[PDB]
Amino acid sequence: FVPFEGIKNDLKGRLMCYKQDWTGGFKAGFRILAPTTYIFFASAIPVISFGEQLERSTDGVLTAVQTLASTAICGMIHSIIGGQPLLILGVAEPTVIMYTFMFNFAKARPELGRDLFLAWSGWVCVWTALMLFVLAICGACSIINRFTRVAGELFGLLIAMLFMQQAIKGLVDEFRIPERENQKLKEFLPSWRFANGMFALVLSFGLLLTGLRSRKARSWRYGTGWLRSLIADYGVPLMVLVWTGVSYIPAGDVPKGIPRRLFSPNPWSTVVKEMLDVPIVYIIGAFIPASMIAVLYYFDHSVASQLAQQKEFNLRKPSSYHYDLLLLGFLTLMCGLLGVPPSNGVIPQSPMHTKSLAVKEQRVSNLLQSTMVGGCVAAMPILKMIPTSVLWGYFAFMAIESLPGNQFWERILLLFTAPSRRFKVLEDYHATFVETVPFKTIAMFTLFQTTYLLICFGLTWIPIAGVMFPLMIMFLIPVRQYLLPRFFKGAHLQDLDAAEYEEAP
Amino acid sequence: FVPFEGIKNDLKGRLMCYKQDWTGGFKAGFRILAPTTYIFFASAIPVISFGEQLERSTDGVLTAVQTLASTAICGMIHSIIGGQPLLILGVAEPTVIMYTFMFNFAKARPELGRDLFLAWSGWVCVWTALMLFVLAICGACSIINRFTRVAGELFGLLIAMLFMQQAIKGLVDEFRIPERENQKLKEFLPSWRFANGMFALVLSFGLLLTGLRSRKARSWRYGTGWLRSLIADYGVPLMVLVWTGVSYIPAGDVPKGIPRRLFSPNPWSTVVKEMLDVPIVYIIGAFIPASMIAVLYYFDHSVASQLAQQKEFNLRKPSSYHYDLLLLGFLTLMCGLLGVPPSNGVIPQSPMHTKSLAVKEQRVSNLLQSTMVGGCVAAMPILKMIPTSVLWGYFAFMAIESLPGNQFWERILLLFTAPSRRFKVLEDYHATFVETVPFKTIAMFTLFQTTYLLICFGLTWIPIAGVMFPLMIMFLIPVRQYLLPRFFKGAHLQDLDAAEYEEAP
Fold first, then answer.
1. Which terminus of chain A is more exposed, N or C, with fewer CB under 10 A?
2. Per the UniProt record, which residue ranges are transmembrane (chains A, B)?
3. Residue B410 and residue B373 share a domain
4. Sign of the four-CA dihedral B400, B404, B405, B409
């Protein structure tokens, strides 16, 4: 834990291959475009969805433009001067939730109001940058091995529940009048509103089901190999385009806002000044949410890097955890100054990128994908054709796609499985702890984990205290270290909380 | 082919067990209700759907009331005095198509008009009864072994295509104004019409997907055994009820006819006289459609009986093909006199009934199920709560459910399968001809069968000549006998057109 030792080691290790990182990427030629576009499509659409969420939750202060710009700039900077280019940066849901809490707090306080929300966010980002600098200097990344499976799967499931909640919220609001829209327009009559709601339901469910089916196209029997691969890789964008076109079918026989489309404005049509006007008391109070955003980033960046640098990939280059965290602090400071939400490592974008590069490790794919994500801002008129129902369907799609490889979800299903029926579980691929651990212990572990998850999810509903859930997430580390061994017996915990995904036939 | 020999033999064989047929049913006790209700639910809903189809195609002359009454009465009469009680009688789609053609013909001719449509149908039914009497007396049922697989699967696929066409027609018409409804009502405004259309889409697709998923509930892992069996048996009615309730959710915030519901009237709120007023020329011309209805019935009754009396069931009682055909002629005459469409054997209602009775062969289950089908007429107000979108979804459901066990559909899929990909077909359960027959011969056979099917389907679109498709169906017998052996080599035809469903692991 010697200060500056880790950063120096990572810089030394990554400074002997920089020219190699660039040359190998240039040597790959035009063949490097396929992974680049794959990751770009995996990254942009969730960013646009988070931007629409922020727009509906921030009264239009933040939109898809800000999220796209932040993602793009942070990605280019990380690719050029970052330590681990395989890591993919972008705006994530927890950041959206934090900013929603901060906006709700600011709106209710006249001293700040909606006008100083971005300035208060910038001060929060300054504080977060300071804490990340401290954590990176003190070598707190040397203990990332304690972010065991339990916390990772609990956080993943919580994010999935938030995604589903947002999808349901959007589908419900499709039946209502927007808060900041003219109420006299024809499209907002009760009949047209009901029609828009049902059309949104149709489009969202179609998108969801078609994408889920397409995710397993390479396993299909029909079609050519290249077509099957193209589908399995780009079903989400392809289905988005298809259902947009479907939405455009009755365009001639209905009003203009039927179905509703992206509310994000077209930009074609710095806040350091206001950060000086914020009262000192609120500048100090920004310490609170900054600590929790810093905790979230310290967790997510490290976990995403660990996933992207799995030993099975046979990577021949070292890791840059500490320098990556320091650069994340710098990026957070810069984004707060610019008036955009900060970006951090995302999952499974980084492992998917590494798999697509399987390894051809270089800094060109990330740079290019961030460049096109930023250029999508210039294509805002085209993106504005996408209905919001498709975005809600995509939210539900991610919520459902967070489940497959999650052991907590499988253990919940086992808990809800009938006693006379577990042979069916044993008839297919299953985890080792099913055989090597008694069912009662698995049930107790799953019940404790589910209670913790539901407590965190309920806390998220509290107006002000709901900004504390990262603290609960981080409390799982010492709990797993100290308390669980008291109530559990060694190998049971090791199998139920193994750092490796163990499967049996 | 000695006249009256077959009928005498069947009557003799079935007259030594009649008292046994009744006593065994009475001895079963209340346990006989489960198969009874299962078959009643399998029979009623398609009958209601066909009634709605006739209502929309007959300008309200025929509705679900007539179809239900015909099904009920014919079923009770067959159970009491029929030869094969396991056979289930009801109104089928080909009868609906024939009556639609006859109504379209009558409407365009002023001498008949809509007022004499039922009288002309009664004369057609009299002719059909005479032809069925002739066929049963001449022993034409001694050659039912020539109704090979090719014709059966072609007819099944044609009926499936008709079902899907009707479902699409209904879903499209949900977006429009009914022909015989007040156009000034609020529910028929463009906005409300669009809303009703999209709600219909939602309900129909939900019903379809949920029913398809529920059909394999016994294979699920979740839930109790009794619950899984109940779902796998009654998913269709359960899903109908669920989606009706869903349709009732926004009832308070929308107009009265949103969503649209059954147009069949509530009866609570004989045509021999008019058959004398029909011109003699049309009485003679009724010979034409009568012959084809007779051909359809001679095919379907015999095939359904053969399926319900499969040797695997180990039935200890003889068959009554000829007497069954004679009784069908009598029932057709009676129904034509009463002014209702005739009923005939249906598939897979009879095999499903036999399976549910697996065999406890008796006349009580059919009698009871027909009695409750008839009593459903008294429950017309309750049935009128069901939206039409659910019925269109059920149409699509039957269309899709006609495919699984059909070898023609599998061979079409194989034809559209990629050459480098047939190992995937070989990786699962498959038919024997896949291994024992070259692919080129299978492709030629499938192409010929598909061309024949498409020709029949296109003929069905002709206004007047579309009533000739049963003749094409019957032409497959002599074709298979004489022409195919010229172009095919023995064992190839035997495997591709085997009377037994041969499967390989």
1. C
2. 32-52, 72-92, 117-137, 152-172, 192-212, 230-250, 279-299, 327-347, 380-400, 457-477
3. no
4. positive
Structural domain ending residue among the three candidates B348, B380, B399 = B399
Q: How far is Cα B370 from Cα A201, in angstroms, rounded to an integer?
A: 40
B330 to B4, B55, B132, B136, B333: CA distances (angstroms):
16, 26, 9, 11, 5
Q: Measured between CA atoms, how close is B241 to chain A, in angstroms?
A: 20
Which of helix, strand or coil describes residue B211? helix
Q: What count of CB pairs under 8 Å joins A to B?
A: 53
Q: How far is B500 from chain A (nearest CA, A)?
A: 27
Q: Report the b/e string of A386-416 with b at 16+ CB within 10 A.
A: bbbbbbbbbbbbbbbbbeeebbbbbbbebee
Q: Which of A243, A249, A233 is nearest to A202 (CA)?
A: A243
Q: How was this structure determined?
A: cryo-EM
Inspect the interface and report whether the beta carbons of B194 and A254 lie closer than 8 Å. yes
Residues from chain B contacting residue A418 (CB–CB below 8 Å): 222-224
Helix (H) or strand (E) holding B287: helix B287-308
Mutating which of B174, B191, B222 best tests the A interface, going by the most A Cβ atoms within 10 A?
Answer: B191
Structure tokens belonging to residue A354: 């590494």
Structure tokens at B460: 């069905």
Nearest to B221 by CA among A439, A505, A421: A421
Question: Which member of B198, B221, B224 has the closest CB to residue A199?
Answer: B198
Write the residue in B224, B253, B424 that is nearest to A221 by C-beta. B424
d(CA A79, CA A372): 14
A211 CB-contact burial (10 Å; exposed 0-12 / middle 13-18 / buried 19+):
buried
Say which of A198, A209, A421 has its CB closest to residue B221: A421
Cβ atoms of residues B351 and B307 within 8 Å: yes
Angstrom distance (rounded) from CA A208 to CA A215: 11
What is the number of helices (H) and of strands (E) in chain A? 24, 4
Residues in B touching A202 (Cβ below 8 Å): 198, 201-202, 205
Q: How many domains does chain A fold into?
A: 2
Cβ-Cβ contacts under 8 Å, B417 against chain A: 221-222
Search chain A and give the residue with CA nearest B204.
A202
PDB resolution in Å: 3.0
- Distance (Å, whole) CA A160 – CA B357: 47
Judged by a CB distance cut-off of 8 A, whether residue B198 touches chain A is yes
How far apart CA A444 and CA A438 sit, in angstroms, is: 10
Contact B305, B350 (CB under 8 A): yes
Do A340 and A424 belong together in one domain? no
| A184 and A300 assigned to the same domain | yes
Residues B447 and B498 in one domain: yes
Query: Which of A379, A399, A419 is the last residue in one of the domains?
Result: A399
Q: Which parts of B402-481 fold into alpha helices (H)?
A: 407-415, 422-426, 433-436, 439-460, 469-478
How far apart, in Å, are the Cα atoms of A153 and each of A301, A303, B115, B275?
15, 11, 71, 77
State which residues form the domain around A152: 5-399
In A, which residues are within 8 Å of B202 by CB distance? Answer: 198, 201-202
Same domain, A395 and A412: no
Residues of chain A contacting B416 with CB distance shorter than 8 Å? 222
Indicate if B440 and B499 belong to the same structural domain. yes
